Amino acid sequence: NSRTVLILCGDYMEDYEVMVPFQALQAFGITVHTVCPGKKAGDSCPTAVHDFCGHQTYFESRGHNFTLNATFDEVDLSKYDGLVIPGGRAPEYLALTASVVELVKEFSRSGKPIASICHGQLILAAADTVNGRKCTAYATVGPSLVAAGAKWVEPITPDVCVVDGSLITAATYEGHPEFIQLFVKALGGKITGANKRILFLCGDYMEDYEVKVPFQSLQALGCQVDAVCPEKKAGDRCPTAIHDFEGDQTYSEKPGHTFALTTNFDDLVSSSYDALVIPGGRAPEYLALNEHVLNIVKEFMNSEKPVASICHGQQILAAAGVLKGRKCTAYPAVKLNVVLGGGTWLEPDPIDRCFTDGNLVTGAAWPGHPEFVSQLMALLGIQVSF
């Protein structure tokens, strides 16, 4: 009934490509270990934000530091049911690290599932494990996979995934939902109950992980997931903020990935949605002022549909007056808004704790994604069974 999965990490792997699988898979009940050659449990890796700005290739800036939870030197490969390889700029050097090539060789000859995304596939080409195997990758990776005897599948769109028995591949983090889903299925997983429409209340400078990880995690299960922002329409984008904890008395801020909205705020019917999700960051403080944002929250809470809100997301719940006589957590500073909103505080120590009060699920910040999503799934009647 359970699984354990290894993620092969390195310096400047793409932030989304490690974090989404890492937390979506934990949310689904699987144990996940992260390793990097040369590093031990509790070391960190810098990450890359790869995005487009209309140049002929992607731009890069720094993402959240990513703290490993395991020690590469001590990994016993027989304890793992599958392997995940994030993209970004880590694979190109990990592909030349003898200890990584050996690990990947060994894991591939066991026949266990390997899910590899974007530049990840370079490590597979170096390990010579793709001969006669069908696979996609970031388009610039295709020549090397071709030269390694792969059956290359040109990614006609950025969300393309390929499955070839135990080999799962994707081109970019845009393919995360099908990529993760195909990997869960490869592990023997069966997903039930995912026929749900979910709405995300987004805004500018919401937190980069706190929108993308729950959004993709729920898509991977099979949910129809929509993202709205007042005054914007489908295909408009929201800048995002990366909040990290770099030793000051509060978090740091830098730009994250831009995030594509999918539907029109004015067009929305709340009745057609099964649940609401509220990312944190700096959008909730201003969304908390929009009446139509408050009306939507009031409708869900009234009708006892699941509402999941994380971190600063609870500022909109408090301002809507829907926290009265309710129990919830939030970012520690947002305890002010919870208590002032008539709510009872649940203490987020450690900061990845999440809580359920009837139809309301709350978390405190991005480390809490596994619990946040898991507890949302329980309210939605979604199960992953092995």
Add this chain to the structure above:
Amino acid sequence: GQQMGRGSMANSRTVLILCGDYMEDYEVMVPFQALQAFGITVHTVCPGKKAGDSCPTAVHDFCGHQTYFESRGHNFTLNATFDEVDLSKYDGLVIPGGRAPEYLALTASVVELVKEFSRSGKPIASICHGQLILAAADTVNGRKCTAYATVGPSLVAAGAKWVEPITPDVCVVDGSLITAATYEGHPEFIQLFVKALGGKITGANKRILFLCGDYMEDYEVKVPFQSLQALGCQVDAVCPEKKAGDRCPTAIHDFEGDQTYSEKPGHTFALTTNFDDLVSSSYDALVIPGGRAPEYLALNEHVLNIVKEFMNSEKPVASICHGQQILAAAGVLKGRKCTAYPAVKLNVVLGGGTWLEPDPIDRCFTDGNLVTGAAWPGHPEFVSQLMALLGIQVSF
């Protein structure tokens, strides 16, 4: 550093600023330096930190999006230690905004401090997000107050008579409680606090012009400009080829361990009058911020002409840091005495001037009509010496 018990004199005051990591860089530095220029001793504390430690600050600006964006501002060095504060010694409390208030508001020792200060009745001036701490200290029930618009629901839930800020410069006073929405309200915010402190301003019916440019230093424009507006001066800012409501990007210059200063983007700065409509003889004084604008401004003939016009008629001219490149190039420093950013001693000496060593770095000097400072730490003496030339006084 300041003489730390000076505000105890009868004609003076001591004010405490409640600081924290990622407080808004203007909302700490402008009252920190304006209040000193007005003859007030100011202490700065952060919970869990001591005198001499420093706090990161946030630069909060708008850029076309639905809420502000942020980058790092100047590091701010504390001059007092939080857990040795004797509250009974302070006549006033200032609370900056930015990202510090939300966590300070959940710090028990900070809430204890604002409660205790609140029941004393002495003036509290809180700006932008600072007001979150007041909500948490429960000190606003039935009191009139404004704040950044997003601090609204909290103030209301704490029983405030909330005043939605219609424009970003809105300020509210309810007895000794003074509140502003954003730094755009600094001039009135600071004026109202000075007044609540018993301060009386005389002589401030003056017109003052700032010679601005791209990548001028962020504090060296903002601080003198808003300090002078807080006195009730009409202050205008011009840049060649730009007009009213155009903006200049600014540079944050700080010292971070290398043999010279580092540079990062600062806040954008709005010019107030057209470069070409301006009538320079209608101004009482000239101010020249530093940074990297002066080196290119020093090549503009209209800029040099305005400089010669003021020095000619012996009107007050205040220049700081690199500003003195413009003066040197204008030929107007010949036989004159001044300081500058240390590097700019080259320009001063080459311009026939006599060098006044900026030691310590916050020292400013006056030679007749000419006030000069070396860098942004010198703003208290810099605005003080310009006030004394203009006949402006703040009296307690």
Add this chain to the structure above:
Amino acid sequence: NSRTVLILCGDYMEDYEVMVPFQALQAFGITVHTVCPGKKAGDSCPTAVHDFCGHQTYFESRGHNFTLNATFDEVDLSKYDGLVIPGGRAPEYLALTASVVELVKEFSRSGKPIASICHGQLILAAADTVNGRKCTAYATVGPSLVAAGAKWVEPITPDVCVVDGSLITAATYEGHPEFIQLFVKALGGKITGANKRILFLCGDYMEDYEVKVPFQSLQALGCQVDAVCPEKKAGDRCPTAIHDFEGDQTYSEKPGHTFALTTNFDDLVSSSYDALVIPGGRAPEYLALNEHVLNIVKEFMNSEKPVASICHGQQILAAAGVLKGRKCTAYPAVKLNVVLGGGTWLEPDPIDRCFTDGNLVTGAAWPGHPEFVSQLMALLGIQVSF
């Protein structure tokens, strides 16, 4: 017959204005030493990237850290034939360091050549060594030079250079080609065979040094050098990336100087050039997918004309199929591409070593520009003789 040259460095000196002469002059056979007061050999200076973006003056971001190879305190000036002084924001504080003014004064009295660029000339004003001498500089440096008695030449375009006897000046890094050439001449050097046409295959996020250093070194020799990028015209620009080694397991990335293309990609005829150069960075991975790019590379390789590729540029050669049975080095990660493209790997140890195999020169990364450009010159019949 050789020459030893000193470069007077400081913190926040302009990245191009130290690196370009540092590496061109070594390529030309000259020994170059780099010093900064208060620092010893093996210490580093931060650098500034000064670029234009439509504001009324330049903007600044951080460039590559620069490692000094000599110790200021230990300089014996009678052993240097020439002196170079980079611009940026270092000269303004350098000009008030008494040991720096003394050094320049002593050097100037000897009548030996001094090349000073941009803001560099502030130190000359401070040293009072410009009275009656014809010089240019960055426009904002004019009044100081005039006040020091200079015969000022207002730079009308950013590439203006002036030579007055042993004094060579330039206004900006746009003037590097003539600036460097004039300095080589002042040292008694004679350049022969540089009447060649060279084509740089450029792209977005190519590496900042890897385009600029080889490009401007080739121009300083007298070569006509064109730069092209798919879908772009003469006058278009590419953003560049700065890759530096800052203690992580792979390089960091930050924006570099934007680079102007000189000629239209679509009109281009490959046969009208004598040689090809390919910079590294992140452009090669995407350029390797462009058919016309690969056609240009096959034409040069087939006709056996000199081809010089550095770092990641070899991704393009490899995809072109032209590394089959060839010998070459590349950025270490790029070995995957070399081997999979049928090449024989040459270990770039030390990292600044370059290799020639017939018409093909390869280097591993920017530290290798001295040998990269030296070996290209050898194939083109270009020489610098003293």
